[PDB]
Amino acid sequence: YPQYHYDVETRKLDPSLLNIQTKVLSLLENWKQVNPDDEYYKIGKEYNVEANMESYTNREVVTEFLSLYKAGFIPKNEVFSIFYENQALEVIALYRLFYYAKDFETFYKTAAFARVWLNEGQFVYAFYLAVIHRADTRGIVLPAPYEIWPEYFMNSDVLSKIYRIQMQKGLIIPEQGPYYGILSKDNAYYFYANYSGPLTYEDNENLLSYFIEDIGWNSYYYYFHNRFPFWENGEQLIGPLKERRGEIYYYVYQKILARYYLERLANGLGEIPRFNWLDKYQTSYYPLLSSYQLPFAQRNDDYYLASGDNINDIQFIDTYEKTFLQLLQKGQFKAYKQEVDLYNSKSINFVGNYWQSNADLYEKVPKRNYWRSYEATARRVLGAAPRSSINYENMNIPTALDFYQTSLRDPAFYQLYAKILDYINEYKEYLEPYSQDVLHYVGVKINDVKVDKLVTYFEYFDWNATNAVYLSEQQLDTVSPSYIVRQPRLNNKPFTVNIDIKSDVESEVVVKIFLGPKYDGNGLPISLEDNWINFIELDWFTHKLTSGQNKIARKSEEFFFFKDDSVSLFKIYELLSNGQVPSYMVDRYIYLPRRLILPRGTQRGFPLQLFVVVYPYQAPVKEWESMRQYIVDNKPFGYPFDRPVTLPYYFNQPNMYFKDVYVYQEGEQYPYYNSYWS
Amino acid sequence: YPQYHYDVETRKLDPSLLNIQTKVLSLLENWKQVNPDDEYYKIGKEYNVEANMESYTNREVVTEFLSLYKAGFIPKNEVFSIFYENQALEVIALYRLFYYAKDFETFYKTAAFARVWLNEGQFVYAFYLAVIHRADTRGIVLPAPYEIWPEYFMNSDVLSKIYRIQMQKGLIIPEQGPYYGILSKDNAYYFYANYSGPLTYEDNENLLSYFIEDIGWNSYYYYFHNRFPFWENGEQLIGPLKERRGEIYYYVYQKILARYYLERLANGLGEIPRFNWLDKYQTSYYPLLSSYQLPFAQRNDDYYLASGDNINDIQFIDTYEKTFLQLLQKGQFKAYKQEVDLYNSKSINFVGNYWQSNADLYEKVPKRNYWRSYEATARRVLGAAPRSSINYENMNIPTALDFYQTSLRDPAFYQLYAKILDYINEYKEYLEPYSQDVLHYVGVKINDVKVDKLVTYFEYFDWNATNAVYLSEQQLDTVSPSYIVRQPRLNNKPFTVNIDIKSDVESEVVVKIFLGPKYDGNGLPISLEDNWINFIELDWFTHKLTSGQNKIARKSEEFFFFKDDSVSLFKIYELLSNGQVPSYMVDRYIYLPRRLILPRGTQRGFPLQLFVVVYPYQAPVKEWESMRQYIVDNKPFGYPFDRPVTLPYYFNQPNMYFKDVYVYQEGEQYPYYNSYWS
Amino acid sequence: EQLIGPLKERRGEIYYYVYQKILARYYLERLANGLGEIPRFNWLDKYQTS
Amino acid sequence: VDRYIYLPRRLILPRGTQRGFPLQLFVVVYPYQAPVKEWESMRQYIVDNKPFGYPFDRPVTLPYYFNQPNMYFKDVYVYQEGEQYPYYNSYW
Amino acid sequence: RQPRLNNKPFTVNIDIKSDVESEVVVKIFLGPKYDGNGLPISLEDNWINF
Amino acid sequence: YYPLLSSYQLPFAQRNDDYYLASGDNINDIQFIDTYEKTFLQLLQKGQFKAYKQEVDLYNSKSINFVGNYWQSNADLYEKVPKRNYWRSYEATARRVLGAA
Ligand SMILES: *[C@@H]1O[C@H](CO)[C@@H](O[C@@H]2O[C@H](CO)[C@@H](O[C@@H]3O[C@H](CO[C@H]4O[C@H](CO)[C@@H](O)[C@H](O)[C@@H]4O)[C@@H](O)[C@H](O[C@H]4O[C@H](CO)[C@@H](O)[C@H](O)[C@@H]4O[C@H]4O[C@H](CO)[C@@H](O)[C@H](O)[C@@H]4O)[C@@H]3O)[C@H](O)[C@H]2NC(C)=O)[C@H](O)[C@H]1NC(C)=O
Ligand SMILES: *[C@@H]1O[C@H](CO)[C@@H](O[C@@H]2O[C@H](CO)[C@@H](O[C@@H]3O[C@H](CO[C@H]4O[C@H](CO)[C@@H](O)[C@H](O)[C@@H]4O)[C@@H](O)[C@H](O[C@H]4O[C@H](CO)[C@@H](O)[C@H](O)[C@@H]4O)[C@@H]3O)[C@H](O)[C@H]2NC(C)=O)[C@H](O)[C@H]1NC(C)=O
Ligand SMILES: *[C@@H]1O[C@H](CO)[C@@H](O[C@@H]2O[C@H](CO)[C@@H](O[C@@H]3O[C@H](CO[C@H]4O[C@H](CO)[C@@H](O)[C@H](O)[C@@H]4O)[C@@H](O)[C@H](O[C@H]4O[C@H](CO)[C@@H](O)[C@H](O)[C@@H]4O)[C@@H]3O)[C@H](O)[C@H]2NC(C)=O)[C@H](O)[C@H]1NC(C)=O
Ligand SMILES: *[C@@H]1O[C@H](CO)[C@@H](O[C@@H]2O[C@H](CO)[C@@H](O[C@@H]3O[C@H](CO)[C@@H](O)[C@H](O)[C@@H]3O)[C@H](O)[C@H]2NC(C)=O)[C@H](O)[C@H]1NC(C)=O
Ligand SMILES: [Cl-]
Ligand SMILES: [Cl-]
Ligand SMILES: [Cl-]
Ligand SMILES: [Cl-]
Ligand SMILES: [Cl-]
Ligand SMILES: [Cl-]
Ligand SMILES: [Cl-]
Ligand SMILES: [Cl-]
Ligand SMILES: [Cu+2]
Ligand SMILES: [Cu+2]
Numbered sequence A, B: 001y002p003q004y005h006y007d008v009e010t011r012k013l014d015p016s017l018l019n020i021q022t023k024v025l026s027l028l029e030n031w032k033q034v035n036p037d038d039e040y041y042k043i044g045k046e047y048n049v050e051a052n053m054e055s056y057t058n059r060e061v062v063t064e065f066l067s068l069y070k071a072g073f074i075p076k077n078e079v080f081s082i083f084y085e086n087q088a089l090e091v092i093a094l095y096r097l098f099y100y101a102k103d104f105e106t107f108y109k110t111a112a113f114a115r116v117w118l119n120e121g122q123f124v125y126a127f128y129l130a131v132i133h134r135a136d137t138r139g140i141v142l143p144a145p146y147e148i149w150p151e152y153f154m155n156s157d158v159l160s161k162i163y164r165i166q167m168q169k170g171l172i173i174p175e176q177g178p179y180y181g182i183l184s185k186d187n188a189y190y191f192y193a194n195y196s197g198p199l200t201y202e203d204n205e206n207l208l209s210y211f212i213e214d215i216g217w218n219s220y221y222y223y224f225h226n227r228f229p230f231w232e233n234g235e236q237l238i239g240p241l242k243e244r245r246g247e248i249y250y251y252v253y254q255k256i257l258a259r260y261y262l263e264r265l266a267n268g269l270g271e272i273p274r275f276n277w278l279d280k281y282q283t284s285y286y287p288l289l290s291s292y293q294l295p296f297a298q299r300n301d302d303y304y305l306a307s308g309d310n311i312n313d314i315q316f317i318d319t320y321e322k323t324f325l326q327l328l329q330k331g332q333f334k335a336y337k338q339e340v341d342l343y344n345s346k347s348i349n350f351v352g353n354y355w356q357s358n359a360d361l362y363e364k365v366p367k368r369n370y371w372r373s374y375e376a377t378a379r380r381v382l383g384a385a386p387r388s389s390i391n392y393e394n395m396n397i398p399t400a401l402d403f404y405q406t407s408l409r410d411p412a413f414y415q416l417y418a419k420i421l422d423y424i425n426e427y428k429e430y431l432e433p434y435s436q437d438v439l440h441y442v443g444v445k446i447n448d449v450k451v452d453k454l455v456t457y458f459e460y461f462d463w464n465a466t467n468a469v470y471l472s473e474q475q476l477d478t479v480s481p482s483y484i485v486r487q488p489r490l491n492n493k494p495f496t497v498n499i500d501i502k503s504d505v506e507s508e509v510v511v512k513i514f515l516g517p518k519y520d521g522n523g524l525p526i527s528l529e530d531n532w533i534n535f536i537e538l539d540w541f542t543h544k545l546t547s548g549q550n551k552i553a554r555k556s557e558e559f560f561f562f563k564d565d566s567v568s569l570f571k572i573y574e575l576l577s578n579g580q581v582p583s584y585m586v587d588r589y590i591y592l593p594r595r596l597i598l599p600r601g602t603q604r605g606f607p608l609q610l611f612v613v614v615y616p617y618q619a620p621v622k623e624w625e626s627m628r629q630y631i632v633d634n635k636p637f638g639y640p641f642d643r644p645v646t647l648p649y650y651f652n653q654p655n656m657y658f659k660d661v662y663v664y665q666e667g668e669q670y671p672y673y674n675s676y677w678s
Numbered sequence C: 001e002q003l004i005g006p007l008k009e010r011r012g013e014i015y016y017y018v019y020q021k022i023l024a025r026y027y028l029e030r031l032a033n034g035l036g037e038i039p040r041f042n043w044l045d046k047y048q049t050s
Numbered sequence D: 001v002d003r004y005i006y007l008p009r010r011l012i013l014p015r016g017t018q019r020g021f022p023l024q025l026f027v028v029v030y031p032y033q034a035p036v037k038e039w040e041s042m043r044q045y046i047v048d049n050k051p052f053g054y055p056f057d058r059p060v061t062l063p064y065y066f067n068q069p070n071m072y073f074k075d076v077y078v079y080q081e082g083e084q085y086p087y088y089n090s091y092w
Numbered sequence E: 001r002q003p004r005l006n007n008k009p010f011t012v013n014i015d016i017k018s019d020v021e022s023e024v025v026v027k028i029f030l031g032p033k034y035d036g037n038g039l040p041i042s043l044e045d046n047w048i049n050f
Numbered sequence F: 001y002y003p004l005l006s007s008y009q010l011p012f013a014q015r016n017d018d019y020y021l022a023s024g025d026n027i028n029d030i031q032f033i034d035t036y037e038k039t040f041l042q043l044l045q046k047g048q049f050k051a052y053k054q055e056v057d058l059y060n061s062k063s064i065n066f067v068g069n070y071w072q073s074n075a076d077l078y079e080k081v082p083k084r085n086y087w088r089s090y091e092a093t094a095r096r097v098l099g100a101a
C-alpha cells in the first residue's frame, strides 16, 4: 500500500481567536489525566461555580447544575455514556453550564473545574460539544474525534501494543519491532493496524470491515450527533431551520444506510436484513473494543432479544411502532398537541422528531419527568449487555451502541435504522409524486454525461493515538512520545463529471449529481420505483447556462457533500503558528470524507448509476440566509428523490440523465496485506 | 476486614538443589518478556537442538520436535491454550523435549532456547510442567499459579489499574491513590480487588464469587491438571498407581463439585443445574477477564448451543454419552481392546479414563492420527466463542474454559462435570454395597464427637502480580516495582475434632473425617442414600487404640486433605537464602487450601454433618517411601462413600458417628466493603 | 359510591396501595429465604413458574 | 368488626435467622393537618389528608432530599427462635 | 392445628427535639436492605419496597 | 390430559397442552430413552448378534421373544447375565416422562 500525501486546504484564522484556539486545545490534551503542574489545574481546583452564579446568562441552568452536583456526580475512572440516564442528566447539566457561561474566561474556568473535579469522559464529551456550539468559539478547529477518543477507533490488539510500549518506555529489542508491525522514529512509534476479521463479524460481513470501522465514517456519525443532540430544542440547534430537523434526521440516516448498502453490494452481501423483535437475532457481533476498564459486550449468534427481563423494553418498542402505524391510518391528527397533516411533505419534521424522541417532539406539552426513547430502548435490547447492567446505575458493560463513536461498527445499527426508515418510507407514500411539469425544465437538454475512470484503492493513513495512553509525570511536564496508528483506508482517484447541455436561453440553474446502485443482491436491475431511496446525493451547485451548447466540468474534489480528511493534531499546531486553520475541519466537518465517495471496486467493475438533474434556480428565503453555504436553494433535501417515484417515465426528462458507471479497484484487493513480509 | 499473616510451614531444601532452584526461578521471572542482557539470552539464542540430538534420551522426541519446528511454531504475542489443537501439538512436543533432556544443563539450555525463540505462553506452560515431572528438579518450589499468570486470576478493572500505574511510572497525584483503592509503600503498589458482581454472574450466583474466583480454588485445579495431564501415559505419571488414574479423576471432580455445592447451599442457590445439549442454555457468563490482546468470550443468557456450525461437535458429544449408556447395558464388554467388568469396582479406572479421553484409554489400540475429546468438545460448545474462532488455526477468542487457570470461574464448568459424574454415578449402581460385616469394627465404639466452634471470616490476602506488567529495560536490568493485589479471602478459625472411642483391644486403626450437607435447596434433610456423593473427605490417618477409653484430639491444621496457603515469591526468595522451602507447596500442592474447608457461615448458622469412621488398619504395600503420606491404606479413595449406600441402617455402626455442626460467620458477611470511605 | 362513598375518588389509590403492600411483603419473605426478586415474564414465551 | 381489613400482626416481620436478617426501619415526622370535613366519617381509617403511602407514594429521584432532620433510617435485624422450619410436627 | 409465623412484641422508641409545641403525624415503614444479589438497595430503587 | 382421578389423598397429575418433555431435569431420562431406541435400530442393522449374552437371529421368527423382552426390560432379558444392581426400564422411564408429574 502507498502512503497518503495531500496538500491541505487552509485559510487564515481571525487573530482575535488565536488565544481561544490555544486554550481549547490545551484543555483537550491528555484529558484522561490531570497534571497538577498545568495551568488549568490551579484555576479549576479553586473555581467555585456557586460563587460565580452571575457569570452565567441563565440562572436556572446554574441552579439545576448545583442541585445535581450536591447529590454527587459519577466518580472519575468510570465508563461514561450519554445512554446511561443518571450520567446523561449530569452531563447535560454540565454542557448547559458550559454553554451559558457569559464569556470565554468564564467558560474556560468552568471547563477547568470540570476537568479537575469530574469524570473524564463526561468532561471531554461536554467540552467538545460546547466548543461546537458556543458563539465565541465558532471558527476554531477541534481535533478529529478519533484523535480525542482513539480507544474507540481501533481494536484491542492494536491498543495492547501501544500500552505495552508505554509500559516499557520503548521496545526492549528494537530490531524486533518491524516483525510485529511496530516502527520507531524520533520519539514516535508507528503501529500498523488491521480491521476486524471473521472473529468479530459473521456471514462474511468481515469483508467490509475496512468500511464500517473506518475512522472517518465513524467520525461522521459522531459529528452529526454533536451537531444535533436529541436533548436540545431545535431553536438552539438550527434556528430558522428548526422546522427541518426531522427532515435532516431522515436525510442523514437514509444516506448512511444507502452508502452502507453500496458497500454490501460491492462485497456480495446483498440487502440489509429485516428482523422480528420476538425471534432469535441472527446477526452476531464480537467487538475487539474495550473501554480500558471493561470489555465491550458481545452478542452471540441467535441471541434472544425478548427475555422476561427485557419485556418492558420490548413492549415499549412494539407500542411505539404500533402507534406510528395507527398515525398512518389516521392521516391527519393531533399528537403531543401538534397538528400533523401527513399529506403535506412538511410533516417529515414531526415524523423525524417522533422516531428520534427528541426535545422538539415534546415541546408543546408540559415538561415531563416521564420519558422513554425508542432508539435508546432499541439500542439497549440489541446491545446484549447483561440485564443487571441496566438495573444498577453504577455498573455497566459498555456496548458499541452506547457510543456515537462506535455505533456504525455494529451491523445491528444498520438493521435498527433500516427498520425505522422502513416506517418513514411508508409515511412517504402519503406524498404526492412530483408532476412532469414540476420535473421538466423546458429549453434545457442534457445531451451527454462523461465520467473519468472510477478507481478505488487502499492506502496507509497515519493518525495520532497518544490520547489513549497514560503518560508519566516526567512526560506530562515535558513533551510526550507519539503513538501513531498506521491503517489502510479506502480512497478514490480524483475524477471529473462532464455534463454536456444545450440550452435555448441563458439561465441560472441548479445542478445535482446523485450516485446509486444498479443491481440488487440477486443480480437484478433495480427499477426507479424501488431505487429512489438508494440514491446518494453527491453534489449541489448553481451554474449559469448560455444559449447554445454548454459544458460543465465538475470535479469530485468540489462535490458539495464531501470534505477533505481531517488533519492531525501536529498539523493543527503547525498551521496555528502561521495563523491558519484547516478550512474543511472548521466549516464543513459535517460532510462525508471524500475518500468514501465510491464503494471499493470489484473485479467485475462494480456497476453504479450516476443521476444528473438540472432545474431552475430560486434563491433560499431571506430567513435562511444566515446559513447559505449549507443550503444552495429552497428545495427539499434530497430533491427530487425525497418522495416516491411511482411512474418512472416521469423521470425521462431532457434535463435529467442516468449514466451507467463502473468502479475499479487498483492494487491489492484486501486491506490486510500489511505484514513485514508484505 | 483484617489483614492476613500466617507462619508458613518450612523444611530444608536439599543442598544439591539450590543451584537448580535458583535457575528455575530466574527463568520464570517476567516470562512475558525477553531481556537480552540476561544470562539465558545468549545461551538460548545460540543453542541448536539438532546439534544436541544425542543429549536427549529419546531420539523420536527430538525428531518429532524438529518436524513441527520446521513447519513453524506459533508466533510470540499470541494467545496460547492447550485446547487449540495445533498449539497443543507444539507445546506437548516442546514438553517432551524438556522432559527427555538427559541432565539439568541440557534441560536449562533447551528452556533458554524456548524462552528466546518461542511463544511466551507455550514456554511457561511447558517449563512449569517439566519442573513438576522431571526427577532432577522434583523437590524444589515453584511460584503459585496466580503469581505466574496473574492476568488469569483477577478482573480487568484491577488489571487496568496496574497497567496504568506501570504506564505512568507511579501515581501522578499519590495522595489520590487510596480513593481509587491504591496504596503505595517503598516502590510497591497495593491494589484492592473485588470479586465479580451481578454483571458477570446471573441468578444471584454473584453471591459466591468470592469462592469460585478464589485464587487457591482455581490454583488447585491448575495443579491437578499439571500433575495428571490428560495427554500423558499413566506409567510416566503415577507408576504403580496407574490402574487408579480413573479413580483419581472421579475423586477429584466429585470433591470439586461437592465443595461448590456446599457454597451454593450456604448462599441459598440450591442444587447444580442439569441441562439439555439441544435446548437454550440458561446460565449466562460475562467474564471481566482478558488475555491482554483480546477479551474473553461472553455467553449471553439462553445461548443456543446446537447451531448448524456446531453440529459435528454436538453429534460427537451425544454419541459419547449414548455409547456410555450402552456400555452400562452391556455390563461386561471389550472397549478399545480393554476387557471391562463393571461389576468390579476396579473398572472405575476405565470409566474415569473414558470420560477424560486420556492417553490410557487408547494405550491398547494402535497409535491414532484420529482423536476427539469429549471434554474439549464440550468446553468449546459451552464457551460461546464465535464459530470462526474454531475454524481458523491462527485466530481465537479465548474463553474461561480454554485455561485450567480460569475454568472454575464459569458456572458451566460445574454443570459440565455434574453431567459426567451423573453418568459415572449410574455406573456406580453396578457395585455391591458394603455389608454390615465389612463396615462394623467389632470391639470398637465411638462414644462421642465434639467440635470447637466453626467460624468463617474474610481477611485481606496479598499476592504478587508483577509478572502481569511489561517492564522497561531499566527495570529489567536493575529491579522492578512490585504490583501487589490485596484481596479479601474466605478463611476459618482453627478448630479441633475430639473423638471419644471405647476399644476392647489394643489395635492400630484408620480414622477418617468427612464433611457434608444436611439440607438440600428445598430445606429438606438429605437422606444418606442421596447424600453419600455429597460428603467431602477431610482427614485420613492411623492411630493406636489402647484398651478402654481413648480420646483423639485432631486439629484442622493436621487434616490430610488440606494444605497451607501458597507463599508469595518474595517469601520464597527469603526462605531460599536460609535454605528453606514451603513444605506444603513442594509436597502437598495437590490438596485443597485449608482456608476453604468450611463454606461461608450464614446468619442462620449453616447446618452441616460431620461423619467420623474408625476401621481396622491394613498396611498398604508401600510402593515407595513417599506413598504413605499420600496413600494411608489399601481402601478405595473416598471409602466408605465410594459407592452407593442402598440401606442406611448398614451405616448405624458403633465405629461410625454422625454429628450435626453449624458454621458461624464473624465480621462482615460480604467481601466488597473495602472502599476508602468504609 | 356504594363502596366508599366520599372516598370514591381514592379508589384507584387504594388499589395501588394494597397490591404494592402485598407484593412488597411477599418480596421481604423471598429475600428472607434467598429467593431474590419477583420474576418478570413475556406473555408469548414459556412460563417458567410451575 | 372494625379492622378486619388490616394485615395480621403476626406477619409484620419476615421469618428471621438466628444471627439476624437485615432490614431498614424508616421513621418520619411531619405536621398534622386534619382530614377536611368531606371525609370526617372514616377518620379511624385515615389519619391525615396525605396520599396513602406518603412520603413513598411517588419516585424518590434525589435521596439527599430525604436527609431531613425529621426523618430517620435505622438498620434492624430479625432473629429467629426455635425451629427454623415449620414441618417438624411429627409424633416422633 | 397448623404452625404459623409470629413475632415477639416489640416497642419503637423515637427521640425528637422540637423547637415549638405542635401536633404532628408519625409514620413507621419497614423495608429491605439488600437485594437478592447481596447488594444494598439504594433509596431511588427501594422506595416501592417500603 | 386432565384426569378427574385421584388417589383420595392426592390428585392425579395433569398434563397441559404442548408439554415440553425434554427439560434439564428430565435429560438423563430422555437420554436413556433415546439410547434404548438407537440400540434397537443398531440391532436391526446387525441382524445376527449377541445381546445380554443371548444369541439372537432376527431372520428367525422365534426372535420375537428376545425382541418383546427387550422392549419390556423384563427379567428374562437379563437372565443370562449376573444379577445386577443397575437397572433402568424403557417403559417406566417413558411413563415418567409422559406423566408430567
Ligand atoms: C494483518 O492481517 C494479516 C493477515 O492475517 C497479517 O499477515 C500475516 O502476517 C504474518 C506475520 O505476523 C505473516 O507470517 C509470516 O510469513 C512469512 C512469509 O511466509 C510466506 O512465505 C513462506 C515461504 O517463504 C511460506 O512458508 C508461508 O506459508 C508464506 O507463504 C513467514 O516466513 C514467517 O514465518 C516465520 O515466523 C513464524 C512465526 O510468526 C514461524 O512460524 C516460522 O517458522 C518463521 O520463523 C522464522 O522466522 C522467525 C522470525 O520471524 C524466526 O524466529 C525462526 O527461527 C524462523 O527463522 C511468518 O509466518 C503472514 O504471512 C501474513 N499473512 C498474510 C496472508 O499475509 C498481518 O500480519 C496483520 N497485520 C497486523 C498489523 O496485524
Ligand atoms: C501526537 O499528539 C501529541 C499530543 O497533542 C502531540 O504533542 C504535542 O505537540 C505540540 C506541538 O508540537 C506540543 O506543544 C508544544 O509544547 C511545548 C511544551 O513543552 C514544555 O516543555 C518545554 C521544555 O521542558 C518548556 O520549555 C515548555 O514551556 C513546556 O512547558 C510548548 O513550549 C510549545 O510552544 C509552542 O507553542 C506556543 C503557543 O502556540 C508558541 O508561543 C511557542 O513559541 C511554540 O511555538 C508547544 O505548545 C504539545 O506539548 C505536545 N503534547 C504532548 C502531550 O506531548 C504530538 O506532536 C503528536 N505527534 C504526531 C507525530 O503527530
Ligand atoms: C468493591 O465494591 C464496593 C461496592 O460496590 C465498593 O464500595 C463503594 O465504593 C465507593 C467509592 O468508589 C463508595 O462511594 C462513596 O460513598 C460515600 C458514602 O456514600 C453514602 O453516603 C453519602 C452521604 O450521606 C450519600 O451521598 C451516598 O449516596 C451514600 O449513601 C460518599 O461520601 C462518596 O461520595 C464522594 O465521592 C464522590 C466521587 O467518588 C463524589 O461525587 C461525591 O460528591 C463525594 O465527594 C462515595 O460515593 C461506596 O459507598 C461504596 N459502596 C459500598 C461500600 O457499599 C468498593 O470501592 C469496591 N472496591 C474496589 C477495590 O473496587
Ligand atoms: C514481586 O515479584 C517481583 C518479581 O518476581 C519481586 O522482585 C524480585 O525480587 C528478588 C528478591 O529481591 C530479586 O532478586 C534480586 O536481584 C537483584 C538484582 O539482580 C540482586 O541484587 C539480589 O541479590 C537478588 O538476586 C529479583 O531481581 C526481583 N525481580 C524483579 C523483576 O524485580 C518482588 O520482590 C516481589 N514483591 C513482593 C512484595 O513480593
Ligand atoms: Cl485564560
Ligand atoms: Cl519488545
Ligand atoms: Cl534449532
Ligand atoms: Cl494517578
Ligand atoms: Cl489512578
Ligand atoms: Cl488422592
Ligand atoms: Cl459391539
Ligand atoms: Cl490423546
Ligand atoms: Cu447469524
Ligand atoms: Cu439465565
Ligand SMILES: [Cu+2]
Pocket (backbone or CB within 6 Å): C047, C048, C049, C050
Ligand atoms: Cu421452572
Ligand SMILES: [Mg+2]
Pocket (backbone or CB within 6 Å): A084, A388, A389, A390, A391, A392, A393, A394, A395, A396
Ligand atoms: Mg447500569
Ligand SMILES: [Mg+2]
Pocket (backbone or CB within 6 Å): B388, B389, B390, B391, B392, B393, B394, B395, B396
Ligand atoms: Mg482458532
